[PDB]
UniProtKB/Swiss-Prot annotation:
Belongs to the ATP-dependent DNA ligase family. This is DNA ligase 4. Testis, thymus, prostate and heart. It is linked to LIG4 syndrome: Characterized by immunodeficiency and developmental and growth delay. Patients display unusual facial features, microcephaly, growth and/or developmental delay, pancytopenia, and various skin abnormalities. Interacts with XRCC4; the LIG4-XRCC4 subcomplex has a 1:2 stoichiometry and XRCC4 is required for LIG4 stability. Component of the core long-range non-homologous end joining (NHEJ) complex (also named DNA-PK complex) composed of PRKDC, LIG4, XRCC4, XRCC6/Ku70, XRCC5/Ku86 and NHEJ1/XLF. Additional component of the NHEJ complex includes PAXX. Following autophosphorylation, PRKDC dissociates from DNA, leading to formation of the short-range NHEJ complex, composed of LIG4, XRCC4, XRCC6/Ku70, XRCC5/Ku86 and NHEJ1/XLF. Interacts with DCLRE1C; the interaction is direct. Interacts with APLF. It comes from Homo sapiens (Human).
Amino acid sequence: PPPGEKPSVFHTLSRVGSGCTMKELYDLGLKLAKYWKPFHRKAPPSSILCGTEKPEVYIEPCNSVIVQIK
DNA sequence: AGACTTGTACTGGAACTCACGTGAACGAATGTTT
């Protein structure tokens, strides 16, 4: 972002779907359950920028969580 | 590829039980003292 501001736009990197136990996935779902929004290809959100791979449901970055990927 | 879940088998420790040992205590007989 411009100096002294929070990030506004995001660029997709990759899907990850392994490395979490069932309980961790349940807790993550409960945390982010309220903030999921349906994804419409015709009116994509401004904050998230995607290529050919698009999600079924998108969550605004302000309410999401950081994940470590190996 | 990778990561988690499920199923099978194994091994060590907990708990329970019996055998054996040791410690302390005691009534009766005997020996000693007065």
